[PDB]
Amino acid sequence: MAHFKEYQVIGRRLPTESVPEPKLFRMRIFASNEVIAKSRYWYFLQKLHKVKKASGEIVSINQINEAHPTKVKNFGVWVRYDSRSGTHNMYKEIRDVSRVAAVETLYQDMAARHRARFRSIHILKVAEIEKTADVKRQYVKQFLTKDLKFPLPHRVQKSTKTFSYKRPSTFY
Amino acid sequence: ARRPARCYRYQKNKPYPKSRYNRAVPDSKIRIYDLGKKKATVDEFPLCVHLVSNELEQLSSEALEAARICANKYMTTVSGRDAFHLRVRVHPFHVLRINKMQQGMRGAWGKPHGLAARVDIGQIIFSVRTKDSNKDVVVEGLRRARYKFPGQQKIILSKKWGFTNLDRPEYLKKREAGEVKDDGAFVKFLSKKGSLENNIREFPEYFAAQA
Amino acid sequence: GKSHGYRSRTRYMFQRDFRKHGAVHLSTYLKVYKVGDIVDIKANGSIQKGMPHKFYQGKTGVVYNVTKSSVGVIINKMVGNRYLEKRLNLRVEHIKHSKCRQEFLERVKANAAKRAEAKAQGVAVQLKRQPAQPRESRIVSTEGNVPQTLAPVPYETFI
Amino acid sequence: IHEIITVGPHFKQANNFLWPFKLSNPSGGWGVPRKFKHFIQGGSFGNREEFINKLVKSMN
Amino acid sequence: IQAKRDAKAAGSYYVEAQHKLVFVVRIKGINKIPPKPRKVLQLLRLTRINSGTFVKVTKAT
Amino acid sequence: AKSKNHTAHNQTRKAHRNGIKKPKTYKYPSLKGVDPKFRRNHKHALHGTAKALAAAKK
RNA sequence: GGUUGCGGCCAUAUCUACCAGAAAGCACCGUUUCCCGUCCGAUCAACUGUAGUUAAGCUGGUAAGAGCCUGACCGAGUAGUGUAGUGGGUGACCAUACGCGAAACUCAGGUGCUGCAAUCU
RNA sequence: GCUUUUAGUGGGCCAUUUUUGGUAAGCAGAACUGGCGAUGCGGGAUGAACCGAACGUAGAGUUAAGGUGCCGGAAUACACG
């Protein structure tokens, strides 16, 4: 949807005489800003409890940062998405540097591989894999080998002019 | 003389059944709806497989008859006559019309043409209760049904115990307790409400301590 | 041909409200309607005399003429680009008082009392109504109420 | 301004005194390709809560 | 700010007060408007595109 | 030579050009159709209290 | 508190099967001259409260009672539905955004309340 | 708020949603709203109705819908597939 932020939203139903201090549910929401995050909070909390935006109240809305934003992590993501003729559960694995960054390439991947837009995807659980050999997918196992090296063949240089005068070279 | 089914694929009209105003409908092509071993008990066939609709449409009675014939034929020739119970879960009550034709659209109200079961998205059409080990056979027996129906269907394994509405573990819990009593092709359950005098008349096997 | 009789299209309107059929109760005949009373029109199906037209079912007007077994009710009718005033001589079985004027006359006694109580105690009465004002700031405690983290649910069939 | 922001006992008269603000189009653009869906769906209309300032200071 | 921080210190959550005032900008032009929003937009003094007003927040607004 | 039969199109836009009007209620509405036995006496109730109020300015 | 007369709301009051009812009242009950009505003093009319009785009515209680009433983050914020998009899909249709929002189901509780007058261990 | 007087009109059509007959139709007929007729402008190459926006004569700025390889004003932009 954008370059994501991760917000915890805490909300409850409004207090009545019979129930003061209600039970205070909490969700971790990936959204672009705090406006969309409080919409996605009531979108899922209406899918789990008898509440809505009118019978409830947003208690706190806080942005969560990656606790180590510069450590490369292997994230296991569980997705519930809607196809053209049904709904499915998926498990994809994403190697990136933050929970923010793994979700932003999750929506780019689900829109490319399966044509799933933001309205069709319920992210169930973004969890980080701590141990190697717990990585289940082979497109992430490629980068966990000891002493990873590879070249980037066929380097194409972007030109600042409309005419080059020598020839292009494609070495690296 | 019969129009192709694409003329009547969608629910374009209001439900127009056989009533005291219609009165001049043809008979339905499908007549029976329970095939296989319908005399079987509940505990004999734990696994239930559905063939669930996925489109809001109408299925003609001719199509239900052909798919019934195809599924029963395959299931009987592969796994015997009495290893399954097939129940057709739709009944074609809606009457289709036709404007059979100097006058053009003057007086264009049509005569009854046939019957159709009006089906929604997610409505099961067939349901086959069977043994667990018969499973894939029943699966293929529903898959060959899929070719006789317009629109998209999907086979779906029920999490219930045959044709009842409780889960296989929860039916197991009521079965190892006393609360299940047998019947002809179904089962009757014990209610915690009702007259306690004749709630022990039925269900004697309850009320002691255990199984 | 078309049919536009006096009681056309009234199958369910003058129906008698299941398991409340039969004769009507006697507090219908004991209400006192004064000239100026605001009434609601709900046609009793079992009294065929003095019924209103089906336009006036659910319509609310004022009483202009009070006679033996009926009252005269003034209803405005929307017709064309204007409103006309309609006079209806309806029996009292097809009528009842409005409770929305019971909102008013009880709030009149409340408003007139609060003006007198504020006049003796500290005027700045402030006796208007106000809409639903937005909520105030508050502090909600997590003591005994630690927030449970709810996640979206995977897809299951369950049929 | 004090009878606007703190909404006063005389908000109605002070606000009805103010002629409606003939704002311009935004100077930075709207920030969206398509205006007419919700702000939640990536458009313009609806509750844009504190970001209304980012609108109005470019439209003012 | 201090009520927020002194609720965070106390093991609580200071909710803010609900906002008492909105600013509304008419975003759509004149043509093809149904009668009910057109009547409301005449009542909120928003009779042309990119015009704005302040609105006191109650349920009736 | 068939044609359109009936439509209610533009009839509400027409009715709100001149802005559909209320019937302009008055103080002292007409006693037309009011019960004549009440209405006969109300002539004498009003005439007697005019004679009695003009008697206050004798 | 019981009971009667007149009621109000008209099942939380109805229905089915049993158990209890001190007092008063009510009732069943005794008689057929008169007024009165009957194929028939059974209904109805009249006479006495005398010969008898709580057996029935009536009132209350019991029942994992049927029915009905109420409530619920029970089902379910489901189905449906107002508004919106140069959203998805060949279509059938379906997601999303701002809103409103059931019914069945399930569980739990309940099983008449009250006005005016009179009377009662 | 009220009144008088008079013109033209009394062939309509389309779009979203609801909806009837029909296998359907650029079909026939309804309901509510918005348009076209009666209306030019920017976009959809082109088109009565769609999208955007309604118009005195001009200048500057900003945008809408739509677009930015070239025709063609404007990134042979960046990012993941």
Coordinates of C-alpha atoms in Angstrom, one line a residue, chain C:
Chain C
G1 CA -57.8 -3.7 -16.1
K2 CA -56.3 -1.7 -13.3
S3 CA -57.9 -1.6 -9.9
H4 CA -57.7 1.4 -7.6
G5 CA -60.5 0.9 -5.0
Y6 CA -60.8 2.4 -1.6
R7 CA -59.0 -0.5 0.0
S8 CA -56.7 -1.6 -2.8
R9 CA -53.1 -2.7 -1.9
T10 CA -54.1 -3.1 1.8
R11 CA -53.5 -6.9 2.4
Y12 CA -51.2 -6.5 5.3
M13 CA -52.0 -2.9 6.4
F14 CA -55.4 -3.5 8.0
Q15 CA -54.4 -7.0 9.1
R16 CA -54.9 -7.6 12.8
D17 CA -51.4 -8.1 14.2
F18 CA -51.0 -11.9 14.8
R19 CA -52.3 -13.4 18.1
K20 CA -53.9 -10.0 19.0
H21 CA -57.1 -10.6 17.0
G22 CA -60.6 -10.3 18.1
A23 CA -62.3 -7.5 20.0
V24 CA -60.3 -4.4 21.0
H25 CA -59.5 -3.5 24.6
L26 CA -61.6 -0.9 26.5
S27 CA -58.9 1.7 27.0
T28 CA -59.3 2.6 23.4
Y29 CA -62.8 3.9 24.2
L30 CA -61.8 5.6 27.4
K31 CA -59.2 8.1 26.1
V32 CA -60.2 11.7 26.1
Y33 CA -59.4 13.7 23.0
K34 CA -59.5 17.4 23.2
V35 CA -59.6 19.9 20.4
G36 CA -55.9 20.4 19.7
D37 CA -54.6 17.0 20.7
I38 CA -51.9 15.5 18.5
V39 CA -53.0 12.0 17.4
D40 CA -51.6 9.1 15.5
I41 CA -53.7 7.2 13.0
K42 CA -53.4 3.4 13.0
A43 CA -56.5 1.8 11.4
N44 CA -58.1 -1.0 13.4
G45 CA -58.9 -3.8 11.0
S46 CA -61.9 -5.1 12.9
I47 CA -63.9 -1.9 12.9
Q48 CA -64.9 -1.3 9.3
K49 CA -66.9 1.9 10.0
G50 CA -65.0 5.2 10.1
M51 CA -61.7 3.9 8.8
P52 CA -59.3 6.2 7.1
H53 CA -57.8 5.8 3.7
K54 CA -54.5 3.9 3.5
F55 CA -52.6 7.2 2.9
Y56 CA -53.4 8.3 6.4
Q57 CA -52.2 5.1 8.2
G58 CA -49.2 6.2 10.3
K59 CA -50.0 9.9 9.6
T60 CA -50.0 12.3 12.5
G61 CA -52.3 15.3 12.8
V62 CA -54.3 17.4 15.3
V63 CA -57.9 17.0 16.4
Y64 CA -60.3 19.7 15.2
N65 CA -63.8 18.3 15.9
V66 CA -64.8 16.0 18.7
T67 CA -68.2 14.2 18.3
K68 CA -70.0 11.1 19.5
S69 CA -68.0 8.1 18.4
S70 CA -65.3 9.8 16.4
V71 CA -63.0 12.8 16.2
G72 CA -62.1 15.1 13.3
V73 CA -58.3 15.1 12.5
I74 CA -56.4 17.6 10.4
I75 CA -53.8 16.0 8.2
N76 CA -51.5 17.8 5.7
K77 CA -51.3 15.9 2.4
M78 CA -48.4 16.3 -0.1
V79 CA -50.0 16.8 -3.5
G80 CA -48.3 18.5 -6.4
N81 CA -46.0 21.3 -5.4
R82 CA -48.0 22.2 -2.3
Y83 CA -49.6 20.8 0.8
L84 CA -53.4 20.6 1.3
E85 CA -55.2 20.4 4.6
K86 CA -57.3 17.3 4.9
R87 CA -60.2 16.7 7.4
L88 CA -60.9 13.2 8.5
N89 CA -63.9 12.0 10.6
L90 CA -62.5 8.8 12.1
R91 CA -63.8 6.6 14.8
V92 CA -61.6 6.4 17.9
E93 CA -60.6 2.8 17.3
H94 CA -58.3 3.9 14.5
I95 CA -56.5 6.5 16.6
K96 CA -54.3 7.1 19.7
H97 CA -52.4 10.0 21.2
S98 CA -48.9 10.7 20.3
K99 CA -46.1 10.2 22.8
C100 CA -43.9 12.7 21.0
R101 CA -46.0 15.5 22.5
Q102 CA -45.5 13.7 25.8
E103 CA -41.8 14.4 25.2
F104 CA -42.8 18.0 24.9
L105 CA -45.2 18.7 27.7
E106 CA -43.1 16.9 30.3
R107 CA -40.0 18.8 29.1
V108 CA -42.0 22.1 29.4
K109 CA -42.6 21.4 33.1
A110 CA -39.0 20.5 33.5
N111 CA -37.8 23.6 31.6
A112 CA -40.1 26.0 33.5
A113 CA -39.0 24.5 36.8
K114 CA -35.2 24.7 36.1
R115 CA -35.7 28.4 35.2
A116 CA -37.3 29.1 38.5
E117 CA -34.8 27.1 40.5
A118 CA -31.9 29.0 38.7
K119 CA -33.6 32.3 39.3
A120 CA -33.4 31.8 43.1
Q121 CA -30.0 30.3 43.1
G122 CA -27.6 31.7 40.5
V123 CA -29.0 32.6 37.0
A124 CA -27.3 31.4 33.9
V125 CA -30.0 28.8 33.8
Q126 CA -28.7 27.0 30.6
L127 CA -31.9 25.1 29.9
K128 CA -31.6 24.4 26.2
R129 CA -31.0 20.9 24.8
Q130 CA -27.6 20.1 23.5
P131 CA -26.6 17.4 21.0
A132 CA -24.4 14.4 21.7
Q133 CA -21.1 16.2 22.5
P134 CA -17.8 14.3 21.9
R135 CA -16.1 12.4 24.6
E136 CA -13.7 13.8 27.1
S137 CA -10.1 12.7 27.8
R138 CA -9.7 10.0 30.4
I139 CA -7.1 7.6 31.8
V140 CA -7.7 3.9 31.2
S141 CA -5.7 1.6 33.5
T142 CA -4.1 -1.7 32.4
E143 CA -4.1 -3.0 36.0
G144 CA -5.9 -6.3 35.8
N145 CA -6.5 -5.5 32.1
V146 CA -3.3 -6.3 30.3
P147 CA -4.0 -6.1 26.5
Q148 CA -4.6 -9.4 24.7
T149 CA -3.0 -9.4 21.3
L150 CA -5.4 -10.6 18.7
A151 CA -4.3 -11.7 15.2
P152 CA -6.3 -12.3 12.1
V153 CA -7.6 -15.9 11.7
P154 CA -6.6 -18.4 9.0
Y155 CA -9.2 -19.7 6.6
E156 CA -11.1 -22.9 7.5
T157 CA -14.0 -24.6 5.8
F158 CA -16.1 -26.2 8.6
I159 CA -19.0 -27.6 6.6

